[PDB]
Design a protein around this ligand. Structure first.
Ligand SMILES: [Mg+2]
Ligand SMILES: [Zn+2]
Lengths: 84, 34, 57, 165, 170, 1113, 226, 94
DNA sequence: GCATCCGTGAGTAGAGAAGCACAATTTAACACTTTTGTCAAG
DNA sequence: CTTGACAAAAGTGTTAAATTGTGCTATACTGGGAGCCGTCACGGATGC
């Protein structure tokens, strides 16, 4: 629906601003891990081949990026309404 | 679902441009100074 | 419309009547590719005739 | 009760016939738009100010509303000189002009009025501003781009149900 | 069939101006909802458009400040009023809506003849022109106060009738 | 409050039972109570005796008798469980072995016959339904003149509908008489040879009519034998079909002689004998006996045709719209006709099972499959045009629906074939069909109402009663008589003056074949019973009907059907005298069966101790939701210990007051313009109406939801809805259903339901969003039922039906269904439609406070302000006379019965107004008050308008104004009097079912169509408004090109455009440029499906892809 | 739940016209206040008017004077336009003497000055005299309220004096309008606009204050029962 | 009626040209946040809001009143479309 | 020329009755490594 | 930052039952069934 299409676009623009507060590689890891670029989840080995790192290396940067976005969300409160 | 060739869709008025004098003169000077 | 007191300008009817008289029938094709009895718009046949006069056909 | 039922049955069938007529009028005139100021034609029609009457076998002045319905807002094709007033060629006829023409007709100075009409317009896929004349809703010359074909179809079709059929 | 459209029973708006109609607030909230959500976000009513929409879903959750924001939305804007059958073009006319309590559209007495509308149960459709072209066309070309003479005959079509004639005649 | 009765006409007989057109016909068709051996050959009994015996030939299945059992479930339980109120049908069938000589008898179950309730309706799938009577051309033999050939006539033989072919006999221009059967024209001479007619016989019977018999002379066909002509006839009727004798005789037998396939009908047979002067043995055109065809009707038909053509006396053409030639098919005949069709289908299946064999152990139960009969019966009561959803807005609504007569329906007319002739009021409608009650619009004259005194006879012809007049004196003998019998007598009018029982006027107004004539008393043979027999029940409820134009009387009678019951409903001050009978015959009220004493009175039930001593408890229908949503309740009207007589009212039903029909309120009305709020039929009311809860009605809405079995898991009706707070679930009980007594508003949950989400991976943006918040997505989603916008109220009833419940036949895959009833008490508001009985209708446009309303000098404000401009053009003066009589009754504290055409007249209303003035003004004198200064000013203007006599005292002039129904009226806003006296009186006004609450709708975005991707339609579907061609024409005429393009693309079906328009607006941006509509893409693809190459091109004639490369290989 | 006190805004131009707005008001109180004030404004505001005129050599009102364009009626009509303000509260009646000779255009300023008497419109035209025309007038100005026709008072100072309709009311016209207004969630409130036209002897504000005071004084009459 | 509608109709040869000019000007005003307006600060259309008097959000109302002042130039083939958009962004970056 | 059958069209809203044998293909229950995902080590 | 370690989570190869598709029944049987016509005028063709 037009409403469903719009809230999809609003969620994308809010997530892209939330990921801007992250680092360069750190944001790209989440985008590649969650599939924000290609549309499919990329496994840790596939992500590791792109940045030349081991599988557990992504899990450190992927999870640390997750924690900082939780801190940003608690301070800004700009993504809570997009899940209900 | 096209614009009908009548009223505001008629070719006699559809291509009318609107501009202020400030923007118009700026375009005028730009041509002269070049 | 006069009998019922309805006031209607003649030009509205004339627009429709103009469309009722828009077509003509070919009586003599002349030096064209038309057929006798063919029905076509008056604007087309007059424009076609002007081209024929411009060539002497 | 017979007439009341008959009138109600007539109204029910008249709405369908009137609605059908308007749709046919729309589909035959939908392309007619005021597309230019002047087609350049010299052709015109002559609106009669008098009509023959059989009971007297003579020419009787037409009703004022009938003359207005054929002259109001129309561009004069030729110059007209009536009652010392020069109505120039290309003049849009106001209601005052029409009444002046009727007054001159009653004085025997004029019998017909040469006016530009859609019937003699040479504009392709529509009419010109001069041959159409006034935008009745605005009492002023029609603006280029108005779908006068749709307006004409609605104008004819709207009072269709008010006819006695 | 079109979006941004509504329908309700019509009643006479004797106090309305010729360019005005009485639009129910509940209709206008639905008719102008996407505009209202943006206005609610600009103010402090809602944090974002999605939460603003959730507020309007439940009637008991609608604050009074939403109705104030709706007034700013419809300022200068016009809606299209249509009564079937649309025999001529004045079967659709543009009016600046005045937000009214109730569920009925208030119609100006002087446009009733053009609509062939009376107040024995007629209903009218409401339409919202969205863009600047559509609003400009309705405000300039389709406004009721700008269409006073009949396109069919050139005679006044929005003219005194019924009680207006009777009072002035008396 | 006394009731004063007007009128001089004494009605010798009362109104017949107003539902007997429904009740009696269905009782005759079922014959459930008469023992089988005494059942007459009508109804479904005739259906059994016509299809049976099923002689396959040798096995013969004969029918002995049928019986109807008790219904499995009561009427109330059928409504709750969506069940059909029906009785099981058992037929006692015997199988006879013609060779062995053994008879096997057993009772087979043929299915269920729907049962008519006491009031005359059916409960089909839990819904109340009415079978509307159908009018059609009666079967028989007719003689109409040829419009193409002057002086020529055509003979038409019409059987029962779908019971044979129509037969046309016409003398061709060459001379030979032609018979047209099944669109095939063949010479009639050939047929008579088949039916055993010689040349000498035809010359003897029909040789005395000019030379027309010469055309009935073909030497070729007289030479051949009847068996040879039968094959010759078979070739013409069925060219190409091998003309074997056995095949040929079967076709002709089944065309004109088979009773199971050709049925002229009892009415058709009777009409044939009356017209042709013969006696039919059966109902077929011919009889097959002794291996040959014997004529029955063709010779008398052709003899009359020649005699009519020859101009002999006593022969006349037939008016096909004459009501003696038009009959009524009631519910009994319509059901029986479909019962016969199903029985014929069942008989055909019996023959094929007999063809199969296994006759060693064949039983009648095995041969009979009842499903074809049940399906035909179920189809008639569910999907027939004549089977209609019962209109029960008020009890009068259901009464009118059961008396409706329809020319449409199966075997009926269509509006295309409905010309002026069928829709006109024929002269024979007098006393049989109301000349007023009809739907205005496309159905005018096609749906009518039975007249009040009219009744349908066994043959289906409407008879109206007349009083026998002999020797100039009127007797009490009443003869019910058809239109064709009515044409033979001079019938006087019911208003003819009578001195005792003898006609006193020397000149009598009468009718002769429908024409008005002036005759002497000795020439009068019959008299009208009453003026009421001309009109239907609804029209008979309009007082001062003689003062209203027929077109506006039509509106008044129709809108009484639309009046909603009111919590304080009042009977009108001015009545016609039928208010009691309508309530009594609607069975909506409760009456004492015999004399007795009331034992228990409660809002739920009433217990009466009858004289015989038995205790009878009457449960009261309380807050029942009608088909239209109006609340139907019965309120007790007796107290404990009260003695009641037989027929005494026990409890008022809906829209009734002390047994009188109460469709509205009695309000004080001022007839005057008011500041433009009365403009064009708009109505001004006082706020005082709201304060005392007049025009307050109770409406109940039903909401339904089903918990289903789904491949991913069953839907659960529960209180645990994910992602919803306690505020949203506050009114739900532990089962997930809203508690009884809770107030629900739009968006509130009526019942919680969770559905398993379809397996689909989420969008990556959602995947990141869920990961940030650390919430695992649940397996179920919110699919709960919520209050639609603009609705709500108080929850009063929750019905929960579960699978396996006794009598609950849920569809497969449905575990349970929950129904919630929400009741709202609706007060009168702006936009609600009000109407009186005289066709004056309008919506409330303004509600004024009491201090703003015009008021009497004694301080009493009026309740309703009506525009006087609605009277003159509509010519309905009955409301004015009602207002004048209401003004007198308001001050005299009394009500009035004025029968139509015989009732209160102006001299007698004015003398009531004289007495009403003495309490209106004489009370003022006693209180110590003279004449107001303001009244003196109005009286001064009144004499300048010629309304009062100059020189009289102010009291006398005020009385003169009062006798005209006018009073001095003060403006509540200013205190100054209205400059002219105003007609003020008490009038009965109804609140109609059209309410702005149910009609207001709006939509920004919502559901879209599957194929066209355009918004759906209807408020119930949250649809958009239809912008049709004429509305498109209006924008084109305005030159609003961009406004038109948005509605064509951005707001209807530009999928990319409508998504981008909504996204732009919520961002504060202007909507983008629109793109191609999706319906045009559908059009192009559908044109390609027709093998048409449709291509969109550019300026350079190059193809342009409007499908974004998605359809290019 | 009682409504807040309304705001009284004034829009007064010059000394002869003014608009007064009172908002917000309870439902129906715009009509409740507007009508009484209008009735008082048009009938009760104290003022002055010409009630009698004496012109030499004139017998009846429907005659003419040789030497002036205006007949007796037209001058009487011009005199009914005269606006005069007494500067002494105890002053009740004055007579204004006018002796002009033609050719002159007689104005209101040509009246002889009288102590504590002020002519508010000295530019008002009275009569146009030609050469040789003598005009002698003695106009009687009284104090009163409302409108009194000449026949209903019949005031004559001397013989041949013509009674004239006395427009005592300084208010020339009252028009009040009630409009629907809102305050938050309340929508049935009233907005009252009072427009008063005055001859200039009193301000439209002063006329409103006098009308309000008159209504207030009458409200105190509902005391001391019996 | 719109204020000065008679004057607005008198400045154009075709009444639909006025609508095109008003609509195109309104979108120019919306695109640049009303920073490109030719109206003086005392000439700005205003909205009566519960929080005070604010600017009128309706650009069509602004466009009609701008055309009444006479400071707007309208016509066909006045300037190239691309050069008009680029130059107006330079003056009003918004 | 004319007579006849066919095809076309006829207002807008809204509100609502076969059974069995056997083969052939597919589904689903298993096991299996295989691959992540991860949580502790430096 | 790798590098082990784990228990899943996921992929995968068999094998079984469940499902689906196909062939075959030998007294003689040999041209169907439902319709079944209350509107009107209009072209346009299609042949007498
Ligand atoms: Mg109506
Ligand atoms: Zn032209």
């Amino acid at each position: 629906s037009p409403v469903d299409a719009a809230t999809q676009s609003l969620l994308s623009e809010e997530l892209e601003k939330a990921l801007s507060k992250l680092s360069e590689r750190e944001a790209m890891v989440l985008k590649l891990r969650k599939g924000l670029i290609d549309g499919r989840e990329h496994t840790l080995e596939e992500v590791g081949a792109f940045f030349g790192v081991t599988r557990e290396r992504i899990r450190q940067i992927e999870n640390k990026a997750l924690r900082k976005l939780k801190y940003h969300e608690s301070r800004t409160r700009k993504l809570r309404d997009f899940l209900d | 679902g096209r614009l009908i060739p009548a009223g505001t869709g008629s070719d006699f008025v559809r291509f009318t441009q609107v501009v202020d004098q400030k923007t118009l003169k700026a375009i005028e000077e730009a041509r002269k100074e070049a | 419309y006069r009998a019922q007191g309805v006031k209607l300008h003649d030009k509205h009817i004339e627009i429709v009547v103009r469309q009722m008289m828009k077509y003509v029938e070919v009586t003599d094709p002349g030096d064209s590719r038309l057929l006798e009895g063919q029905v076509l718009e008056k604007w087309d046949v007059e424009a076609l005739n002007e081209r024929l006069i411009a060539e002497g056909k | 009760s017979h007439g009341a039922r008959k009138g109600g049955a007539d109204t029910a069938l008249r709405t369908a016939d009137s609605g059908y007529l308007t749709r046919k009028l729309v589909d035959v005139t939908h392309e007619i738009v005021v597309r230019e100021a002047d087609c350049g034609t010299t052709n015109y029609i002559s609106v009669p100010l008098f009509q023959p009457d059989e009971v007297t076998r003579s020419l009787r002045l037409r009703k004022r509303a009938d003359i207005e319905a054929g002259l109001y807002g129309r561009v004069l094709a030729r110059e007209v000189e009536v009652l010392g007033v020069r109505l120039e060629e290309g003049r849009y006829l106001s209601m005052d002009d029409v009444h002046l023409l009727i007054k001159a007709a009653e004085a025997g100075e004029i019998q017909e009025v040469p006016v530009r009409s859609p019937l003699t317009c040479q504009t392709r896929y529509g009419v010109c501003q001069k041959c159409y004349g006034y935008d009745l809703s605005m009492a002023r010359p029609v603006s280029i781009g108005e779908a006068v074909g749709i307006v004409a179809a609605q104008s004819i079709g709207e009072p269709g149900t008010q006819l006695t059929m | 069939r079109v979006d941004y459209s509504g329908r309700s029973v019509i009643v006479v708006g004797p106090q309305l101006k010729l360019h005005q109609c009485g639009l129910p607030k509940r209709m206008a909230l639905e008719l102008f909802k996407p505009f209202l959500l943006k206005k609610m976000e600009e103010k402090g009513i809602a944090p974002n458009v999605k939460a603003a929409r959730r507020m309007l879903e439940r009637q008991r959750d609608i604050k009074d400040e939403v109705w104030d924001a709706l007034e700013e939305v419809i300022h200068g804007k016009v809606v299209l009023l249509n009564r079937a059958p649309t025999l001529h073009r004045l079967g659709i006319q543009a009016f600046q809506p005045v937000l009214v309590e109730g569920q009925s559209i208030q119609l100006h007495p002087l446009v009733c003849e053009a609509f062939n509308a009376d107040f024995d149960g007629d209903q009218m459709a409401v339409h919202v022109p969205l863009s600047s072209f559509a609003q400009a066309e309705a405000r300039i070309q389709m406004l009721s106060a700008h269409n006073l003479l009949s396109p069919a005959s050139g005679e006044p079509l929005a003219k005194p009738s019924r009680d207006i004639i009777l009072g002035l005649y008396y | 409050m006394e009731i004063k009765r007007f009128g001089r006409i004494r009605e010798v007989i009362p109104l017949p039972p107003l539902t007997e057109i429904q009740v009696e016909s269905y009782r005759r068709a079922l014959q459930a109570d008469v023992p089988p051996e005494k059942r007459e050959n009508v109804g479904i009994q005739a259906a059994f005796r016509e299809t049976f015996p099923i002689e396959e030939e040798g096995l013969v299945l004969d029918f002995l008798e049928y019986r109807l059992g008790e219904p499995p479930f009561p009427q109330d339980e059928c409504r709750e469980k969506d069940l059909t109120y029906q009785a099981p049908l058992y037929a006692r069938l015997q199988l006879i072995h013609k060779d062995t000589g053994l008879i096997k008898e057993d009772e087979v179950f043929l299915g269920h016959i729907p049962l008519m309730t006491e009031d005359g309706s059916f409960i089909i799938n839990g819904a109340d339904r009415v079978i509307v009577s159908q009018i059609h051309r009666s079967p028989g033999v007719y003689f109409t003149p040829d419009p193409a050939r002057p002086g020529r006539y055509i003979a038409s033989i019409i059987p029962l509908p779908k019971r044979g072919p129509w037969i046309d006999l016409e003398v061709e221009p060459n001379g030979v008489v032609s018979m047209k059967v099944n669109k095939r024209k063949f010479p009639l001479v050939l047929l008579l040879r088949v039916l055993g007619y010689d040349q000498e016989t035809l010359a003897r019977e029909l040789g005395a009519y000019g030379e027309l018999v010469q055309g009935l002379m073909d030497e070729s066909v007289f030479a051949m034998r009847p068996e040879e002509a039968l094959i010759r006839l078979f070739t013409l009727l069925r060219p190409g079909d091998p003309p074997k004798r056995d095949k040929a005789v079967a076709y002709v037998y089944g065309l004109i002689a088979d009773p199971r396939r050709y049925d002229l009908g009892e009415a058709g047979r009777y009409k044939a004998e009356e017209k042709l002067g013969i006696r039919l043995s059966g109902r077929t055109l011919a009889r097959f006996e002794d291996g040959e065809f014997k004529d029955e009707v063709f010779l008398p038909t052709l003899r009359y045709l020649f005699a009519l053509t020859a101009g002999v006396p006593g022969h006349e053409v037939d008016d096909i719209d004459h009501l003696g030639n038009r009959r009524i098919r009631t519910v009994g005949e319509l059901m029986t006709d479909q019962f016969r069709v199903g029985l014929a289908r069942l008989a055909r299946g019996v023959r094929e099972r007999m063809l199969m064999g296994s006759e060693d152990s064949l039983t009648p139960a095995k041969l009979v499959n009842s499903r074809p009969l049940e399906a035909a019966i179920r189809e008639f009561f569910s999907r027939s045009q004549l089977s209609q959803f019962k209109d029960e807005t008020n009890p009068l609504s259901s009464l009118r629906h059961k008396r409706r007569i329809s020319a449409l329906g199966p075997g009926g007319l269509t509006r295309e074939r409905a010309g002026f002739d069928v829709r006109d009021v024929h002269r024979t409608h007098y006393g049989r069909i109301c000349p007023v009650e009809t739907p205005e619009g496309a159905n005018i004259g096609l749906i009518t109402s039975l007249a009040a005194y009219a009744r349908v006879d066994e043959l289906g012809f409407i008879r109206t009663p007349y009083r026998r007049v002999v020797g100039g004196v009127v007797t009490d003998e009443v003869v019910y008589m058809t239109a064709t019998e009515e044409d033979r007598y001079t019938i006087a009018q019911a208003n003819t003056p009578l001195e005792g029982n003898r006609i006193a006027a020397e000149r009598v107004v009468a009718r002769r074949k429908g024409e008005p004539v002036i005759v002497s008393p000795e020439e009068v043979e019959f008299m009208d019973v009453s003026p009421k027999q001309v009109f239907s029940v609804n029209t008979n409820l309009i007082p001062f009907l003689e003062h209203d134009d027929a077109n506006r009387a039509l509106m008044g009678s129709n809108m009484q059907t639309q009046a909603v019951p009111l919590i304080r409903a009042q009977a009108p001050v001015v009545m016609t005298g039928l208010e009691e009978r309508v309530v009594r015959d609607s069975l909506a009220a409760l009456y004492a069966e015999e004399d007795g004493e009331v034992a228990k009175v409660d809002g739920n039930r009433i217990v009466v101790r009858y004289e015989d001593g038995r205790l009878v408890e009457y449960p009261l229908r309380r807050f029942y939701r009608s088909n239209q949503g109006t609340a139907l309740d019965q309120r007790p009207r007796v107290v404990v210990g009260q003695r009641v007589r037989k027929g005494d009212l026990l409890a008022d039903g809906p829209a009734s007051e002390n047994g009188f029909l109460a469709l509205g309120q009695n309000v004080l009305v001022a007839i005057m313009p008011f500041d433009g709020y009365n403009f064009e039929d708009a109505i001004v009311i006082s706020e005082e109406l709201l304060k005392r809860d007049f025009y307050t009605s109770i409406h109940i809405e039903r909401y339904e939801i089903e918990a289903r079995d789904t491949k991913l898991g069953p839907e659960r009706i529960t209180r645990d809805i994910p992602h919803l707070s306690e505020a949203a679930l506050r009114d739900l009980d532990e089962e997930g259903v809203v508690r009884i007594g809770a107030e629900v508003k739009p968006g509130d949950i009526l019942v919680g339901r969770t559905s398993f989400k379809g397996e689909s991976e989420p969008t990556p943006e959602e995947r990141l969003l869920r990961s940030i918040f650390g919430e695992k997505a649940r397996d179920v989603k919110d699919t709960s039922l919520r209050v639609p916008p603009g609705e709500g109220g108080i929850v009063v009833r929750t019905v929960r039906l579960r699978r396996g419940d006794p009598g609950v036949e849920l569809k497969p895959g449905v575990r349970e269904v929950v129904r919630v009833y929400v009741a709202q008490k609706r007060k009168l508001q702006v936009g609600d439609k009000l109407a009186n009985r005289h066709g004056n209708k309008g919506v409330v446009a303004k509600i004024l406070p009491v201090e703003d309303m015009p008021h009497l000098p004694d301080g009493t404000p009026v309740d309703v302000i009506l525009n006087p401009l609605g009277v003159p053009s509509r010519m309905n003066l009955g409301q004015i006379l009602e207002t004048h009589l209401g003004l007198a009754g308001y001050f005299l504290g009394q009500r009035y019965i004025s029968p139509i055409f015989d009732g209160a007249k102006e001299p007698e209303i004015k003398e009531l107004l004289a007495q009403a003035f003495e309490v209106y003004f004489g009370k003022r004198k006693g209180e110590g008050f003279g004449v107001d200064k303001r009244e003196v000013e109005v009286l001064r203007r009144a004499e300048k308008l010629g309304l009062v006599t100059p020189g009289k005292t102010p009291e006398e002039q005020l009385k003169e104004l009062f006798l005209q129904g006018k009073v001095v009226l003060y403006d509540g806003r200013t205190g100054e009097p209205i400059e002219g006296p105003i007609v003020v009186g008490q009038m009965f006004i109804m609140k109609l079912y059209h309410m702005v609450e149910d009609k207001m709708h709006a939509r920004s975005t919502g559901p879209y169509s599957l194929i066209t991707q355009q918004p759906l339609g209807g408020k119930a579907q949250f649809g958009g408004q239809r912008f049709g061609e004429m509305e498109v024409w209006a924008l084109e005429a305005y030159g609003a090109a961009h406004t038109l393009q948005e509605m064509l693309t951005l707001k209807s079906d530009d999928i990319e455009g409508r998504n981008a328009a909504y996204e732009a607006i919520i961002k504060g941006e202007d909507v983008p440029e629109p793109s191609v509509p999706e319906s045009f893409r559908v059009l192009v693809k559908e044109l390609q499906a027709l093998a048409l190459d449709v291509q969109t091109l550019d300026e350079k004639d190059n193809p342009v892809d409007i499908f974004e490369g998605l359809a290019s290989k | 739940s009682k409504l807040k006190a309304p705001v009284f805004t004034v829009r007064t131009q010059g000394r002869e016209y003014g608009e007064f707005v009172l908002e917000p008001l309870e439902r129906g109180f715009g009509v409740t206040l507007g009508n009484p004030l209008r009735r008082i404004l048009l009938s009760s505001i104290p003022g002055t008017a010409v009630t009698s005129v004496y012109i030499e050599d004139v017998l009846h009102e429907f005659s003419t004077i040789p030497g002036v364009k205006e007949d007796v009626v037209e001058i009487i009509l011009n005199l009914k336009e005269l606006v005069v303000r007494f500067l002494n509260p105890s002053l009740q009646t004055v007579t204004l003497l006018l002796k002009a000779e033609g050719p002159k255009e007689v104005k209101a300023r040509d009246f002889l000055p009288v102590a504590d008497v002020e002519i508010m419109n000295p530019d008002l035209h009275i009569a146009t005299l030609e050469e040789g025309g003598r005009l002698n007038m003695e106009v009687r100005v009284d104090r009163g309220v409302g409108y009194v026709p000449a026949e209903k008072h019949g005031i004559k100072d001397r013989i041949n004096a013509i009674p004239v309709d006395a427009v005592f009311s300084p208010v020339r016209r009252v028009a009040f309008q009630v409009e629907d207004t809102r305050l938050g969630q309340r929508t049935d409130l009233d907005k009252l606009t009072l427009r008063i036209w005055t001859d200039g002897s009193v301000t439209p504000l002063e006329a409103l204050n006098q009308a309000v005071e008159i209504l207030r004084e009458h409200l105190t009459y509902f005391s001391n029962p019996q | 009626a719109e204020p000065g509608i008679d004057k607005l109709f008198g400045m154009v040869d075709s009444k639909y040209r006025l609508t095109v000019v008003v609509a195109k000007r309104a979108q120019q005003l919306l695109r640049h946040g009303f920073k490109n307006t030719v109206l003086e600060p005392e000439e700005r259309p205003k909205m009566q809001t519960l929080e005070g008097l604010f600017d009128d959000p309706n650009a069509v109302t602004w466009a009609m009143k701008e055309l009444l002042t006479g400071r707007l130039v309208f016509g066909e083939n006045l300037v190239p479309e691309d050069r008009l958009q680029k130059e107006m962004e330079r003056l009003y970056p918004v």
